[PDB]
Amino acid sequence: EDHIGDRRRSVRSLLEEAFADEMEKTSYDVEVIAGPVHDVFGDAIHDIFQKMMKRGQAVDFCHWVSHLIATEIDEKFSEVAFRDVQYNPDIYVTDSTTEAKKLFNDKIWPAIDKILQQNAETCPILSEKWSGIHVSGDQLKGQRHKQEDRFLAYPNGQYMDRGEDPISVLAVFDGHGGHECSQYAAGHLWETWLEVRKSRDPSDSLEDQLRKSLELLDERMTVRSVKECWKGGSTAVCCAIDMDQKLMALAWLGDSPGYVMSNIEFRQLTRGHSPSDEREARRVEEAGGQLFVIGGELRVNGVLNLTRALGDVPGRPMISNEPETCQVPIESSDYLVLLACDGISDVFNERDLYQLVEAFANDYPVEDYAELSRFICTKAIEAGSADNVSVVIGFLRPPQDVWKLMKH
């Protein structure tokens, strides 16, 4: 109503588009290793999310609907309530999770099918209204064999667990040596974030809460990484935005950057954990590592061009898992936050990014704002980036304000 783009649309409208092929089959009368129990639900949500993004929906709807679908499957089809299992550091059960994972795959359409059979008059889910800041998120594989980046863009808790928490959380995770760590981070950050929010002391700043959620995420990831012998790791850059308090926190491990765009420029908020940074080099040396130039750049023990990461258990202590953080007041002249992987910053500097937003806002109408992140990814590949590329954007001021700002 007073909304723009897909935020104008009803749940039914969005589902019927996403599952148009399945509805058509119905109309034609067609009958259309093992992880731990404590990870099943979040694992399922991430798998559903990836499938929903392939069906062409906006990232925020994909987050919301993935939790809905997983919840519906868990309630209607699963013997075990995986959504109610709490992580316990001394418990790790793998009993029948293989069957469970298959269930969360097979029952996606059945879950949605049953919802679409109902009427909004007696089905509350169909009346959902969309809250929170506007976001944009997407990625491209680029000149790579696998997509090892993951990302999150939650306007607030409505899109995580369909609850009431008002804080937005955005993230990008750039995996190396596999996608297991970045996939895990994407599957479970919402869980550790909401756990921290629920248990927070009054003395915990937003910055502390965000840091704690990443510490807890790495703790859970570490257990599974060791049990399954994962070899790789992931960067993280995460942002929590509290619009009421006019505060934004960032936490990062590695070289995926975060920026704020004001009326005049993009400004980088993160400080890359690369061996060329004298501070990081000292941390590596103190941890017993060495820095060698192998190929064209400085690498820790000749392998990693990063000094901090999620996962990388085999690389500890030379590679640190300690997040760096900051907290920044949000001023009235701050327009958007943008998080990306290094695939973007390899080719674009701050001025390039500003000019890309400027170009998009002059070439496309505001109703297409959700496509801005994909635009930047596509432009990065055109500019010769040779990596996976991912971008998430949070609109601190509404898309209308950004378009007004940029209009020639």
DSSP structure string for 177-194:
SSSHHHHHHHHHHHHHHH
Backbone φ/ψ region at 77: left (φ over 0), alpha (ψ -120 to 50), beta: alpha
- Pairing state of beta strands 266-268 and 297-300? unpaired
What is the spatial distance between Cα 368 and Cα 153, in angstroms, rounded to a whole number? 17
Q: Please report, as ranges, the residues that interact with Mg ion according to CB under 5 A.
A: 148, 174, 176, 341-343, 387
Nearest 10 degrees: Cα torsion 251, 281, 147, 195? -30
What is the spatial distance between Cα 401 and Cα 405, in angstroms, rounded to a whole number? 6
- Amino acid, res. 390: S
Q: Is 174 annotated as a binding residue?
A: yes
For residue 245, give the DSSP letter. Answer: T
Residue 148: CB minimum distance to Mg ion, A: 4
Residue 214: CB minimum distance to Mg ion, A: 18
By C-beta, is 237 or 261 nearer to Mg ion? 237
User: Which residues, at least 6 apart from 12, have a Cβ–Cβ distance to it below 8 Å?
Assistant: 116, 120, 126
Spatial contact of 273 and 255, defined as CB atoms under 8 Å apart: yes
Residue 174: CB minimum distance to Mg ion, A: 4
Sign of CA dihedral 357, 258, 275, 308: negative
What is the spatial distance between Cα 345 and Cα 357, in angstroms, rounded to a whole number? 15
By C-beta, is 108 or 304 nearer to Mg ion? 304
Residue 43: CB minimum distance to Mg ion, A: 21
Residue 250: CB minimum distance to Mg ion, A: 18
By C-beta, is 134 or 179 nearer to Mg ion? 179
Q: Is 208 annotated as a binding residue?
A: no
Spatial contact of 6 and 134, defined as CB atoms under 8 Å apart: no
- Pairing state of beta strands 236-242 and 168-176? antiparallel
By C-beta, is 66 or 274 nearer to Mg ion? 274
Residue 271: CB minimum distance to Mg ion, A: 17
By C-beta, is 165 or 174 nearer to Mg ion? 174
Residue 178: CB minimum distance to Mg ion, A: 9
H or E stretch at 300: strand 297-300
Which of these, 354, 337, 341, lies nearest to 394 by C-alpha position?
Answer: 337
Q: Is 342 annotated as a binding residue?
A: yes
Q: Is 175 annotated as a binding residue?
A: yes
H or E stretch at 255: none
By C-beta, is 52 or 309 nearer to Mg ion? 309
User: Which residues, at least 6 apart from 88, have a Cβ–Cβ distance to it below 8 Å?
Assistant: 38
By C-beta, is 174 or 207 nearer to Mg ion? 174
3-state secondary structure of 294: strand
Residue 345: CB minimum distance to Mg ion, A: 9
By C-beta, is 97 or 321 nearer to Mg ion? 321
Q: At what angle do helices 180-199 and 40-54 cross, to 10 degrees?
A: 120
Which parts are annotated binding residues? 174-175, 342, 387
Which parts are annotated binding residues for Mg(2+)? 174-175, 342, 387
